[PDB]
Amino acid sequence: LPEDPRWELPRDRLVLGKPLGQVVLAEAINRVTKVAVKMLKDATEKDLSDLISEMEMMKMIGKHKNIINLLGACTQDGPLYVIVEYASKGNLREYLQARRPPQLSSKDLVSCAYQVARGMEYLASKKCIHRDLAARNVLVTEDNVMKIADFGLIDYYKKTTNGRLPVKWMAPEALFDRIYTHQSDVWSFGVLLWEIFTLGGSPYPGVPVEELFKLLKEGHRMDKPSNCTNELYMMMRDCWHAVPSQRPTFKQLVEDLDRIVALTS
Numbered sequence: 001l002p003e004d005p006r007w008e009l010p011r012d013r014l015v016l017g018k019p020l021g022q023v024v025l026a027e028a029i030n031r032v033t034k035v036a037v038k039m040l041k042d043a044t045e046k047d048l049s050d051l052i053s054e055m056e057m058m059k060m061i062g063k064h065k066n067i068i069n070l071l072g073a074c075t076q077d078g079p080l081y082v083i084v085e086y087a088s089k090g091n092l093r094e095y096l097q098a099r100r101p102p103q104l105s106s107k108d109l110v111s112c113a114y115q116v117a118r119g120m121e122y123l124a125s126k127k128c129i130h131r132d133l134a135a136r137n138v139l140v141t142e143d144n145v146m147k148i149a150d151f152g153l154i155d156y157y158k159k160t161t162n163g164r165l166p167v168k169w170m171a172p173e174a175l176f177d178r179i180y181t182h183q184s185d186v187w188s189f190g191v192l193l194w195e196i197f198t199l200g201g202s203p204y205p206g207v208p209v210e211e212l213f214k215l216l217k218e219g220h221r222m223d224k225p226s227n228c229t230n231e232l233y234m235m236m237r238d239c240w241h242a243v244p245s246q247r248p249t250f251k252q253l254v255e256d257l258d259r260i261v262a263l264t265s
């Protein structure tokens with residue numbers, strides 16, 4: 001694999017450590033920085049294709065506070081190691097669930113939403129469409145900064161590691177017509193807001209795929225969470241507009257969340 005001196009880190013500068021979920025925690029060196037490293041598990045060439053793709057797409061997208069940023073790579077004379085920012089508190093779902101009462105203020109929760117919307121606006125400005133935006137693909141740093149993940153990356157019945165179905169984040173036009181746009185991502189954003197305000201709640205509990213389809217076709221919409229203002233619930237519903245052109249954009253969402261954060265206790 002060809003050397004990219006913008007990014008290449010010598011192998012002897014990386015101290016591999018504990019597994020994270022093939023993603024390990026590591027130390028890049030006179031000061032050490034904790035980072036996350038991805039590597040290939042016996043794997044296909046495709047798997048190597050996919051890995052390199054993820055890395056190159058990160059090269060192009062650029063730096064933002066609210067996304068997992070590439071930090072380097074080990075490409076010469078060994079397996080490929082992609083090195084990125086480490087977020088010590090795991091995904092947004094786990095972070096949220098672990099701070100359920102028997103803590104996060106109202107303002108904290110709104111602040112999370114604002115940050116994810118910021119990350120998404122940037123990715124959008126860079127022409128990137130996520131296709132699986134969800135609390136589980138948002139990671140949280142030690143400083144509680146939201147960072148979007150898996151933006152550089154179907155069986156509708158495959159469940160996640162935690163027993164939930166991804167189709168439940170998917171806008172209708174993407175689900176039935178496989179048409180994906182920034183506006184389908186905005187739909188998924190609306191679902192992710194629901195997760196924030198139900199402190200890591202699971203959407204449509206007990207609803208399998210086929211019944212899911214029935215609900216969407218009938219125009220069903222999730223109930224308002226208990227820890228939710230009408231304004232924030234309207235924001236969700238606007239995200240779930242039947243007609244994609246009539247959904248807000250992440251630009252709009254960022255501006256509205258900025259104002260709300262400010263006025264939230």
Ligand SMILES: Cc1cc(CNc2nccc(Nc3cc(CCc4ccccc4)[nH]n3)n2)on1
Pocket residue numbers: 020021023036037038054068082083084085086087088089090091136137138139149150
């Ligand atoms: C999303 C996601 C989660 C993981 C690995 N699981 C995990 N568990 C706990 C903490 C944690 N921290 C991480 C993970 C990362 C991104 C790793 C990465 C992604 C793409 C390319 C190279 C490395 N940062 N902090 N991760 O993976 N994804």
